[PDB]
Amino acid sequence: CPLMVKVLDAVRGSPAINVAVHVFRKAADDTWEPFASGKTSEPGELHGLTTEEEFVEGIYKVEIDTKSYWKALGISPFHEHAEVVFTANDSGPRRYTIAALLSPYSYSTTAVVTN
Amino acid sequence: CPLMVKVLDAVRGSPAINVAVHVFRKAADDTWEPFASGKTSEPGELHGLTTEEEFVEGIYKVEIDTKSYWKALGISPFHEHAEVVFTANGPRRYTIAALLSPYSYSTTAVVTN
Amino acid sequence: CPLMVKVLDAVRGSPAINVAVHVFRKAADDTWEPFASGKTSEPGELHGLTTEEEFVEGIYKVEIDTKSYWKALGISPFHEHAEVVFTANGPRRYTIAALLSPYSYSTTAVVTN
Amino acid sequence: CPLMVKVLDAVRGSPAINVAVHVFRKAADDTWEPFASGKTSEPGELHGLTTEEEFVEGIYKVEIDTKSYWKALGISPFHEHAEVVFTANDSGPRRYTIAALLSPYSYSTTAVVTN
Ligand SMILES: c1ccc2c(-c3cn[nH]c3)ccnc2c1
Ligand SMILES: c1ccc2c(-c3cn[nH]c3)ccnc2c1
Ligand SMILES: [Ca+2]
Ligand SMILES: [Ca+2]
Ligand SMILES: [Ca+2]
Ligand SMILES: [Ca+2]
């Protein structure tokens, strides 16, 4: 599982469940092509986005739909999404975990990259 | 002014100076149209991006060129940039604050009357 | 001044106003001795805590009363407080910045010449 | 496992390994009594600090020795530790994960509390 996303809620002190996550890859024409998408489970994790075969080198964007998350909880948030854009696999295949921490007016993300 | 960006560096414990920042507004075709840009000053701040007349409601993206910042310091970065996307909806001033590390960033909004 | 504290609220997207802050310096018995305190102002800042003469090298704790802040807003908090502990070691100014959520906080130091 | 600690390194993009963690509990005399301690493993986690029997209500302090961590990596950091102080189990037993993200001049922590 070369790409995993974990999302926590800093208001409620809980995993963020049912958060939609969209991954794009920069194409040769310099536009964002759809790559993979999914939704977080009860523990706030999203596994199975991609495979070692599909996850080639490239510039990837992970868009976490934090807006819909907050709105479903009845809160009107600031940001449209939480994100990372990063170059992947440039020095060979890595495993990437994108960890996001959410509040209505703030987010942070971290990458954990292992070999 | 109605929009200010502030950038701090969590590695060096300092303001992030000479960071390039671009702001875009979402147009009707769902593309991003350049709106304003500049480079942070010694206190890590970027003032004078826009004006009350120009800064209308809509969806904005603040792109902070973090990769160039880290490369200039000789520190290996993860992210291409940081992209901070928000909707602007009485009298208001917005500050977009970012705290930078090589493999992480954090951003908050400070919206005041 | 040599030590400033700045507090932001990640829930409301605002400066954290009227937050109590206490600073302590570690004495030889490894106890904490009150050094300075105050409450944040409208921009979420606390200036005038100490003086150049008073602020010597040593180990300091900045305790931010986050639980009282969240209770005053009617928002359920996790932490008792936030305790920010650091060593103070040429010409320097320190800013201790904190970003608050009910179940999380983040803190950074901005150390400038 | 009622209390778990997870520590990530925001500079290297990795779990923070071999980080010492000390937990204290406020005693009836209002001093901090030692409660439990341990060190993070390869994935940056510390399990087995305590048990359901031992982890009673109380005010707890978790001190993560971030200073020794950075110094072992040859870096001189700002903070002595990363921490939380919190009241635990006041509305009955909960499971607590304390998630910490470290940089040389900054840290953040989050609590994940489940029933
Ligand atoms: C450990 C440390 C941090 C986290 C985060 C996080 C992102 N920003 N600050 C914290 C999200 C998800 N899991 C984590 C486990
Ligand atoms: C802790 C302390 C500061 C922040 C900032 C920030 C930039 N200027 N004032 C604060 C932005 C994002 N996260 C932070 C976490
Ligand atoms: Ca390559
Ligand atoms: Ca409006
Ligand atoms: Ca010295
Ligand atoms: Ca009770």
Residue numbers in the entry:
A (entry chain A), D (entry chain A): 10 to 124
B (entry chain B), C (entry chain B): 10 to 98, 101 to 124
Quote from the publication:
Transthyretin (TTR) is a homotetrameric plasma protein (also present in cerebrospinal fluid) with two thyroxine binding sites. There are two structurally identical thyroxine binding sites in between the dimer-dimer interface with a line of 2-fold symmetry running across the binding channel (red line). In the absence of bound ligand, the tetramer is prone to dissociation and subunit misfolding that generates the precursors for amyloid fibre formation. Binding of thyroxine or other ligands could stabilise the TTR tetramer by forming non-covalent bonds to each monomer, effectively “securing” them in position.
Some individuals are especially susceptible to TTR amyloidosis because they inherited mutations in the transthyretin gene and the expressed TTR variants are less stable. Intriguingly, SFL001535 binds to the TTR tetramer in two modes. Its pyrazole nitrogen hydrogen bonds with Ser117 whilst the quinoline sits in the mid part of the binding channel in Mode A and flipped 180° horizontally having the quinoline nitrogen forms hydrogen bond with Ser117 in Mode B. This dual binding mode of SFL001535 remained for the aggressively amyloidogenic S52P TTR mutant in cocrystal structure. The author thanks the UCL Wolfson Drug Discovery Unit for the provision of reagents (including recombinant TTR S52P mutant) and use of equipment.
